[PDB]
Every structure is written in C-alpha cells, then in structure tokens.
Amino acid sequence: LRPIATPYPVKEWLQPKRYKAHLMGTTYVYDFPELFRQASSSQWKNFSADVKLTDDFFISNELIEDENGELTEVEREPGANAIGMVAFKITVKTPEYPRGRQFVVVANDITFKIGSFGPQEDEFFNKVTEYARKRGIPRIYLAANSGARIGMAEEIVPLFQVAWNDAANPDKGFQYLYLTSEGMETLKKFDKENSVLTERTVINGEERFVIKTIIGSEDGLGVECLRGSGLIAGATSRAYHDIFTITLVTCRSVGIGAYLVRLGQRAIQVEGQPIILTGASALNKVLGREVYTSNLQLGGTQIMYNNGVSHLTAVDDLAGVEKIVEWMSYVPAKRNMPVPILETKDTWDRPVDFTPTNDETYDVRWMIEGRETESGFEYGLFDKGSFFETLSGWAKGVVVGRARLGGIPLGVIGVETRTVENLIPADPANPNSAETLIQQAGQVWFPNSAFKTAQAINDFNNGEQLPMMILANWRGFSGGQRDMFNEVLKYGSFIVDALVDYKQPIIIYIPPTGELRGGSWVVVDPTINADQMEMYADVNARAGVLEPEGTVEIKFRREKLLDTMNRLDDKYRKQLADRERELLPIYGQISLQFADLHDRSSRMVAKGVISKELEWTEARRFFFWRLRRRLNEEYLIKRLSHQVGEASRLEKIARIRSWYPASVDHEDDRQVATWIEENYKTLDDKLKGLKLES
Amino acid sequence: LRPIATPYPVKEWLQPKRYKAHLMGTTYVYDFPELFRQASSSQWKNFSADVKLTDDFFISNELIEDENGELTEVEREPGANAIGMVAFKITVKTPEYPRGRQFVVVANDITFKIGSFGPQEDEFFNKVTEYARKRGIPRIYLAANSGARIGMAEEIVPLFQVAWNDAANPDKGFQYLYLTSEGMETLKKFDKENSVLTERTVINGEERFVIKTIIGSEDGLGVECLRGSGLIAGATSRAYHDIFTITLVTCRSVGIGAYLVRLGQRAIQVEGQPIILTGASALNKVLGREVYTSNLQLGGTQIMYNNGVSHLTAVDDLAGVEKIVEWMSYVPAKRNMPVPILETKDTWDRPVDFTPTNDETYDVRWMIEGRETESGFEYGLFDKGSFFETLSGWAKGVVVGRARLGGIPLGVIGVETRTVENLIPADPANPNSAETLIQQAGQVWFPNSAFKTAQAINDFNNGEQLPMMILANWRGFSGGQRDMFNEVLKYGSFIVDALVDYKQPIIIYIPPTGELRGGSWVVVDPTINADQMEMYADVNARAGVLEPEGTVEIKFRREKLLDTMNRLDDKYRKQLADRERELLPIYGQISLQFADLHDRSSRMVAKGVISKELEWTEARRFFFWRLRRRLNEEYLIKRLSHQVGEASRLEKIARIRSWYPASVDHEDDRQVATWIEENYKTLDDKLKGLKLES
C-alpha cells in the first residue's frame, strides 16, 4: 500500500490495473463512465445552473456476453474482465432528452495484454456494434490499443531442433527445423498434438519430425487476429451509415485501432496520443536508417488534426468526453427519431445583428454565431453559443460545425474569406525535402476544402441525420495546374454525391456580400436533390457563370465597347484613337456595371433558380419557420410512405397538402407548422384510416 | 465547292458543319455512329476473321424529343439539330451479344454555339440519361464542349444610358445606368418588357428609368445554365450507380463538361484534348501575371491520365471509340442481366505457365495475361489477350483491368512488385517550386494506390456489375510521416467501403511468392462482406500480423535467443560473450525461420481464415469452376429473393442447396454448376410453385 494515511481508500491499490492505466497516460477503462457522469452534469450546469440533479439522471451498466454469447447487463467489480474489450450501456437524462437517452461505450482495456486485439475482443466489439445498430442507439468507441495481438507457438520454442549442415561449425548453415520423438510426445502429453504439422524422415539412424508449419495451441497469434480486425473494420464501415459513431483516442491507437478511428469517421484525439500504423522504430528498421524520432511524428495531432482524420483535439480524457457529450447534444436519441429541439435564451424571434460589409474583412464564424464588441454582443444567424465547429484543424477555407436555429439542430457549412495558410512538413525520409507553406485564396475551392465539404455533408447525413445549411460563397474551383494535378475534379464530384445521398432538409443560401460562380454553383444546385434541396440568395449576393470581369472579356469586347462610345460620347461621334485612350477606363467600368446588373438575386428569382430572395437581418426568422415547416412536412411524408407503399414524393406531398384546410396558405411556413403541430393526432387518425389496403 | 473534281461528293461541303468540326480537331457529331460501326466490325474481325458481316449487324437511330418532350427515333439529315446536344440509340450484334445489345450515345455538337450547355441541351442530356437508366442500357457520353452557355441581354446593349457625375468630363465617374421613355417603348414594342427591372425617377426634367436588374429576353445567359448544369451533374452521379457510364473527351471539355467526365467515372481522353475548369488565359488575368501557357498544361493527358481522372488515352477519336467498344465487351447488355460469357481459343482446361520466382523480378501482368518468350507463349491465369488494363497512367503500384477466365468476364487487381516513380510537376504559379520525383516501394499501399484500389472496386461494381479477383500481395500501408499526413488512412478506409458495397462474387488470392501483412490483410478480409467474399492463399504465399523480422523483434528477443543457444549449442551450455558473438548471426536466421513457419497457408487453412490453400499452376481450373458455380448459385439466390420476400442469405442458399440431389457434393463446383445448368427450367418450376404466398 502506497501511499499510507490517505483520508479515503487508495483506488490505484484496490485495483492495481487503475495504476497501470495511469502510468500509460490514460484513464482506467472502468473510470470512463464517471467521466461521462461528470460531463453530463456539466451539460446541465451550462444549460440551467439552477437544476437540482440527482444520481438517477445517469446510469451506466456494463455489458458482457452471457453463456450463449448474448450481451447482458452486469454489476461487478472493475478489472474482472476476462477479455481486453469492455462495454457499457449508458442511460442519461440530458437537456435535449430530459426523460433519458441511450448509447453504448466500447473501449479497449490498455491493461489487458497491452490493449491488443485478439479474436475475442474482435468478436465482442462486433457484438456491441450490432447491439447498438439493432437498437439504433449511438456507438462511442474509446481507443487505447496496441493493434492486432501478435504471438508465437511458445510451446515449440523449447522443443524445436535444428538440422545443421555441419554440427561442429554452426555458422556453416542449417537445412530445416525438427522435433524428436521426445518433442512429439511432450506435445501429445499436453494435448498440443495440433501445434505443429510434421513430416517424418530418418537421418543417420535418428527419426526426425520435420516442422513444415507451426500452428500453435494458443488462439490469437496471427492471421485469426487479422480476420477479426477485418470483421470489426467492416462492422464499423456499416455502423457509420446506420448509427451515430464517434471515437476518442486516449493513449495510442495502432493498426486496426487507427482504421477503426477513421471508419467511425467522427474522431477526437487527445494531445500526445498517436494514431499510427507501423511505429517509428519498426519503420527505421525497415528503412535501415534512423529516419523517425517518435510515433507522434507519424500520428500525433500535428498530423491527424491537420489531416482531418481527427475532427477535434482534447487537452485530456475528460475534455474529450465533454466534446463527445456536446457533439451528441445535436444528434437524435436513436436512428430515425426526430432531431433534438433545444430552445435556449436566444429565441428565433429577433433580427441578425452581425452583417458583413464589402470594404471590411470578417470572420464567417461571426455571421454564424455572432461576435462580442465593446458596444455589446452582435447576434449572428444561429443561437448564441450553439456553434460547435468540427474538422477545425484541416482545410480551414471551409468552416464546418453544428448549430441551433431557435432550438433546431443542424449542420452548418460556411466559407472562410481570409487567405488560408497550411504548413506541409518536410519528409524525414527525403534528405532533399523542405517544409512548404501553401497559401490558398479565400472563396476558392481547393482539393482539401472540397474534400472537407463532401465529408461534412456525409457526416451530417449518416448517423447525425441532421438538416443542413450551406452559406454558399465560392468564386469557383482552383483550375490551376497544381490543383488540377491534385485531382480537384474528384473532390468536387464527391460534393455532388454527398448531396444526392442527403435524406434531411437542405438550405443553400448565398449570403450578403456573397457570390456563387461557375463550377461552385453546379456542385451545390438544388436539382442535384430536388426532394431535399432549396436555394436562396440574399439581395446583396451575386451569381453568374463568370464574374463581371470575365463576362466583359468574353461578351462586351473592344468593338462592342467602341460602338457604345459612338452611341454615348458626343465627342467620339486619326483624331479618335486619342478620345478612345481617354474614355476606355470609364467605359471599362460601365461594361463591368452592365454585366454586374445580370448577377442580381432579382434575375435568380425571375429565372426560377432560387426559392426566394432574402434580407440577411430577416433570415433567422425566415429560416426558423421554413425548417420547422419542412421538418413537419418530412415527418408526414414518412408516415405516408408506410401507408400507400408506392407513390412519388410529389404524390405524397400533394396528398398531405390536400389535408390542410382551404384557408391555410401552403406558402406560409409558420401557419403550416402551427396547423400540423395542432393536428398530429388528428393526422394520425387520417393515416390510420388509409390502412384500407389490398 | 472546294475541292472540285473529286470521285464522290464532298461531304464537308454538303454539310459545312462537318468542316467546322474538323477545323476544331474533332469528328463531326453525326459521323460518330459510323466510328461505332467501324469499331464493332473490327471487334468481329479480331474475334473470328471468317465472319461474314452485313449492315443489319449495326443500327444507329437518332433520338429527338417529340411535341410532348418524349424521346423518339428519327431518320433525318445530319445538322438539322435545333439544340447543341445529340443522341443515338445503337443496336449492335457483337461477339458477346450476337443477337444484339443496346446503348445510347449522347454528344455535344461542337458546331452548335461552340458546344456550350444551354438549358435545352441540359434538359435533353438529362432526358437521355433517364431513358438509358429506365432501360438499364449503357450511356456513352462524347464530350466536345465550351461548358455552360454565357450571355448578356444584347437588346439592352444599344438602349442603356449612363447618369454621369459631370457630362463634360466622363472620367469624373457615373452614378447608375438607365433607360429613356424611348428605350422603354423600344422594349415594349418587341414584347421585351420583362428584359429589365426599372425604377422611375425625374432628374432635372428628364424622366429616367433606373436599371436595377438586367434579366434579358434570350434564355440561357447565366444562372439558368448553372441550374441546368447542376441537374445534369446530379443525373450523372445517379446514372454511375445504375448503368454503365463511359465518356470520350474529343475536343476540349470545359466546366460542367469536366465534371461530367468525372461524374460518369469511366473516361478515355484523346491526346491533345484538354479537360479544364477555368482556362489558362482567364487564370492569367486573375493572377495578374503570365503564369500558364496553354489549356493542355491545366487539363491535358499529362494531368488527367496521370491523375486517374482519365482511365485511358486515345491517339484519335476512332481509337477512343474502339476502346469504349472493347471496354463494353466485358459488361452486361443491360442492368441485372448476367455478365457476358465469351469463350475464345484459350479454354479453361490448361495449367498456368508463367510462375513467379523469389530470386527474379517479374511484371504482374505476366501472371495475369502471360508473356511471350523465345521458347513460346507462357500462358497466365487469365484468357490470352483478354487483359484490358484501365487507370494505367495513375498510381502504377496497383494494376487494374478487366479479363476473362475461360470466358467469364471479371475485374482484376494485381500488385506491381517493381518500385514505381511519379513525376510531380513544378507549379507554374510558384517561383520557388521545382518538379519532384517520388519513389514508391513495391507491395506497399500508398495514398494514391489505395485510392486506385477503392476506385477500381467501385468501378467494377457499379454499372459493370462484374465479379472480382484481387491477387493480394501487399506488405502493408506506408506508415511514414509524409504518407500519414497525406491521409493514407482515408484511402485505405475507402477500400473497406467499396468491398462492403460489392454485389457480385469476390475472390481474394495471395499468389505464389506473395504476402499479405498487418493493415493490408485487415482491409481486404472476407468478413468485410461474407456474402460475396472468399479468400485463398497459394502454398507459396505468406501472411501474418508482421513479417518474420518484426515477429522476431517483438516475440523472439535477446533473452529467448540466448536460452535457445543454451539449449542447442553444446559449447554455450566472461568466456560466453565470445560464443554469443559467433552464434548470433545464425541464431538470428533460426529465429527468422521459426517465425516464417507460422506464416504458411497451412496455418491459414487450420485457423479457418482462407477457404482453401491452392497451387498456382492449378488456379485457372479451380477459379473457373468456382466462379461458374458461384455465378449459378447467385442467380438462384436472386430468384429466391423475389419469392419468399423475407429471409437471410444463409436461409436462401441452404434452401437452394436442399434442392440439389443427395448425390451432389455441395463442395464440387463443377458438379454443382453442371447440375444447375442442366436444370434451370426445372428449378424455374420449383420457384414458380413457391408462389403459394400470403
């Protein structure tokens, strides 16, 4: 017992595995539920400081496999796990789900065979994934591992013999490895007959059993660990499309551990905990040179967070738990349940304070969440303090996060107007390699930013099942040689694919001072997904194939411009080339203005390419009711889908809208939502009466 | 008429648009069906030189929209197209489909408004896509365009007026643009009242109509072209997952044209025809410096083919047509129809001649298709001359293509054992940028090669609907700093996703001299998709978590090795450190051999991680019947799916296998296929009798 004379018992002594975990710079597996209780309690204090919270608000129940491999709940002492993988079913009353929400926590036990993955950990991890998926509840994975388990048939180690070329000189070589009758019997005696594959021969009187394959008695030495890893990689790939999947990296995550981090997509990395494949030491041995310094050089946050593999970093395990808890506050309690409405002090019914100007540089986050000033807080489009930014360390040209719109949770994509710099590090493996600083123009899609956009869209759709708003403001894609070679077309195409797959309301809104040109429009147009998509443009937005400078260059050339001088200039209508020189700069300006006049939201409305033209200060009020209306209608489309079984979206919506009283304006979002909410149970009777099916 | 006195009529004069197309370095749209006839005829000559072919073997029928926008067939003169998009329905008797196969060809008319995309071309392209998708037939797109159409309200050009700050000095500035009552009436007179959005004011007696927005009378000037582009981008994204989509780039492909190339995935680029977004000239104007030289520098084959955006290059339009024709020979006639069996001179019933050795470097293509030698042709695993390689210019570490196995078409993925070099060009935009040569070790997955692998898997699955064989031979993923920063984990994860989505038989086979370690195994394991996947390892293959050098480093350390010297060396059993120095090199070799003995196919079989261990020379015969058996069983699973409506794969297969006579060995592939083929109609009666449903 160390230390003696403490006020309460030494938990690290009561369970020494707690101390092993601590010595490896991580929380002990069995202590993680407590971090979830601490975080859930903080969630309440930050929401309503006055809430009197008891212990029944949070329940953690360890899951273990029964006699038939069926998962059941247990109340046992920490450290009684016979396998290196552990899981808990958590039932917590949160501000979004005050009656309770459920999720599973799977975790490696770093103190059980170094957190390595053997077939039993793999089988259990897969069974927990399936348990969560069947129930539709989120699956949190806590990664603290050594990757697949590695072994040797340690029983053949003291038994094997070597058939030397010349016994007197061992360095002259050897022919094969073998077992004697003594070795063969030793295995027979311990029922380890299946440990080797032998072939009998007689060499100079001696009966030797030539080892042809070493199998081993102990399960979990090689290929079976790779099979199991594959199973859990496929399991996680499938779970990402089905339930909310998140992973917290606490202590190393190696090999399968690294793929699991990525396969679950959503990841929080604790500072100083690497995400690696082959470690630095092993790589140096392969390269035959001392190339790398640490595993952190290969998979630290300066790699993974900058990569976009790590969505967020965490200062310590509790910080990471707190971030999982916060991320989950935006996500339905289970698959196909409505998005969690959380109304705060920031009511839907106010104008937007922060407005961008053309002459002044701004941070797009100010338009999203607002900004503090000396005169006071300038509210943004979304609920004060609801902007939870993710992928913040990668492709900083796009801003992605979750937010709330008068309570409604949604995914937000904004455009960083400021030039973004990235520091591509020097390759240690190449002596003729130096670090390079890459500057990327604002409002221009690059391979990395287009990749981040598609990724964000997918991550909002799968598991999160959130509506989305893209505050669309791009000049186009980078068409230069470097960016074209770096496959910009591939990443731009992923955006289209992500939108095609989207299953919740989408809102594309070109903000004030905003623009959407050429390929940038193409890739985000509501016809990619007419069922979910909708486009809006601010009265101060611009959009066209080209920008006024390009439109002019192609369509208002020198001849057209001189004919304009002949029409408009009394002096112009040998001596003329002189007036031409004087007029051209202002005439260039006239043509730029002529072009710009086609790029207005009024032409967008007239040409029916946007649902409505909007006023920024009035967007919070508009978007709130539009999304609230749309969430109600989507619910009714889904209930109708079960009934009829076969009909188009248009047929379903037309039918739902035919149930609205004659007095209801189908174009009034506030009225339509108000009516639906006043009649959910009356609409339920309507749908139940429709069960007149054959 | 130029030239005079020709033997037959001057086609370029009869239709001058043919000459315009020619002057732009491309085939005239209406001449493309003839290239398809020429190619289809070549297909026959290369298959059976003795075939007497007539003209009814090939039928091309132009599709045009009727009065109600419904596509119908027409026989009209070339060049009567009122829109810049043209389509043909082709019905061709090919060696795979001798009774005929159908597909649509959509193409831009480079001679119609520079091949630009207006709303009518977009609406038609979408209608053709839908026509092909509804029918399940392939959609070939021939790209020769200027991207979205760009315009201005050319009627406002001679009418507009400018409100000068001071009329005497024009360069002092202007306030706004306006129309006079004369201008307003001019528009009123031509029913172009809707061309502008004005606001009346009176300035110093004059009634001016302030232009607030220029809309225009002519459709297809701006945003409506971007809407249409979006529609066709989404349409193509959807078509790739539904039907076989291929694109041939003949003459430039700009903006939406470039995205269409990528969205359809499968692309052949004609040498010298660029795939661009913003052109070089425009980019130089944005950058304010003469950075780029040509559009080919941005989107030529040295970009797109090296990128993997272009799957193949073509020397001229006929070469590209011939490659589409050849690619299609592997693809079903329509969606959900069986893969086209084409048996050639190379019967299934022979051993594999080309066998790799450990001491000799080989080209993996030799194992796939065989190789010519002085002694004669060494046959490979697949049918002689059936290897059609794709993505050949990108990530050369993986070899991807289509092949035939005794007639059966399938996707093939092999590993390039030789070190691959890539030349990353110097960025013209960066003066402190030089070209870099990147060497990539063989049998190691890098970001690019992992991306190519996932891509190939997807491209085989979607549209092609082909079975697959991965000749798995990777040491692992590159875990170094550069490759980890370049997101190797993301691309490795795409492999898993591509396999999860796979709907046709998969065969993973570790070939002779081959290996599969750590993360390389994880990502390709049959548990990712138990329904389709199956693993095999050659008797000369190796597989484990680590390689013998790593296994030794971790599990057979210094102490274990000295205890082994104490056991095995009579001399070893101050003076001992000397014998230790002498013994260690051979003892290191003993430990390397001890490890290697666990890495055998026999342990893989014993641990149940492979379906069977195989002998390479006998693989063609094994794989032929295994795939032929599996194609027959898959067919029966599908017919059963319609009947019962609800049951697992295992329940379906167990039921199908219960119909086999008692004498049939379920493990004999040749017998099982022979029985199914002898009883398709008897099995059809069985399934029809199962329609006893309520």
Ligand SMILES: Cc1ccc2cc(CC3CCN(C(=O)c4c5ccccc5cc5ccccc45)CC3)ccc2n1
């Ligand atoms: C590295 C980098 C930096 C900024 C970029 C900006 C864009 C947006 C494009 C630029 C080109 N473009 C234009 O309207 C445009 C121009 C836009 C601004 C200035 C000059 C322009 C000249 C053009 C000449 C012909 C056609 C178009 C021109 C459409 C919008 C596209 C790619 C960019 N790449």
Ligand SMILES: Cc1ccc2cc(CC3CCN(C(=O)c4c5ccccc5cc5ccccc45)CC3)ccc2n1
């Ligand atoms: C740039 C590059 C080049 C080759 C690469 C090869 C691999 C394959 C790996 C290499 C590491 N590995 C080993 O079995 C291995 C070793 C393999 C060969 C030589 C030395 C090794 C030392 C190791 C020390 C500890 C653990 C493993 C070691 C598993 C297989 C992985 C990454 C590679 N990256």
